[PDB]
């Protein structure tokens, strides 16, 4: 109820995650790289690696999104979440063309993660001072 | 039970994830791939990729599982969740044998993943529309 | 509440971010060009270590929260703190030599087992009570 926006952001992100993975499938077929190999076509390795970078940061994003969303402010976290989704959109397709074209998306994505993390830390400390240290 | 069914599926799924990760460790010994190398025996590389595929799809499953479970229907999401676990079981051992034999498990697993996402989306849309009420 | 779980989760997410970025630093020192993840054995250990931390992280998070909610938060939190340290050992251990990763790995996996156990017990317990 008080987390419906976070839920929505999470579901959209999961689609993008699902999407990226399926894109790795198409590259696999398009650049005749047969499983389980992930080397061969230079084209595939960029798509695969791009996708690999997105999965490792995904749980970080989800945790920091929700911590920020729950302990600081839901609307602001959501907005940031959406920019992260776009940053990752830029990152993924950028990488597929060339390694040089991934930087903006990546930098945008990590900047957003830093801020979510920051807000989450603040909201929790703020909440900690109420329940444990009685500064109600 | 509020989320006891969802919790239960998540613990079962996490255990399978642990199993998969540890099989790759066991695989290093049987096929003699010494760390940090991940190439050599075609057998290890299939086991490695399979587990790697399970890893990249795992957070998707959990999210869609809970969103579906929380906003649409817990029992139905839970049942779908169990099928996903089995699909991955089929996928994993299938891939281990040959890349060709992963497809039933893979298709089955992603089919549930598609379905979980939908119900979660619908249930959330349903919950959002209490902006009106 | 769940404030202790929240704090641990954020502390853990920070370490995950750290590991990921270390792989970037490794690319520079050992001159590995993207998208390649092979080359220097020095780089290859760091990459694998970070990659091993990635596959166990969601496992850790779920059992942490399941343990924290269905058994006991403080106890789960304490275990969580140990897991994070275990992973600190594993990573830096692996970077030095693959042989020196074992202590960190076994400790983190032991904690993962206990969190799993505690979580399973609380969920079984709550489910049977209906
Ligand atoms: C108390 C629960 C301990 C779980 C962690 C653990 O004991 O790790 C295994 C040990 O052998 C340390 O390597
Ligand atoms: C009681 C005190 C210690 C008992 C330790 C038993 C370990 C339980 C193992 C388990 O439940 O498996 C889960 C893990 O394998 C996942 O990493
Ligand atoms: C037969 C094999 C397993 C059935 C065990 C079901 C009961 C598990 C024990 C339990 O629920 O106790 C845990 C509580 O102490 C947590 O408060
Ligand atoms: Na996209
Ligand atoms: Na994962």
Author numbering:
A (entry chain A): 3 to 138
B (entry chain C): 3 to 135
C (entry chain B): 4 to 133
Pull verbatim passages from the article behind this deposition.
The overall structure is a homo-trimer, with each monomer containing 4 trans-membrane α-helices (αH1–αH4), forming three potential active sites at their interfaces.
The structure of apo-MGST2 (with two homo-trimers in the asymmetric unit) shows structural heterogeneity, while the structure of holo-MGST2, which contains GSH at only two of the three possible active sites appears more rigid. Specifically, the four-residue stretch (Ala101–Arg104) at the beginning of αH4, which forms part of the active site and contains the catalytically important Arg104, is uniformly observed in a 310 helical motif within the apo structure and the GSO3− complex. Notably, Asn55 on αH2 forms an intra-monomeric interaction with Arg90 on αH3 in the apo structure while it moves toward GSH in the holo structure. In apo simulations on a membrane, the symmetry of inter-subunit interactions early breaks and the 310 helix at the active site unfolds in one unit at a time. Moreover, such unfolding is also reversible with some runs undergoing transient refolding. In this state, the highly dynamic loop L, which protrudes to the solvent, can trap GSH and help approximate it to the binding site.
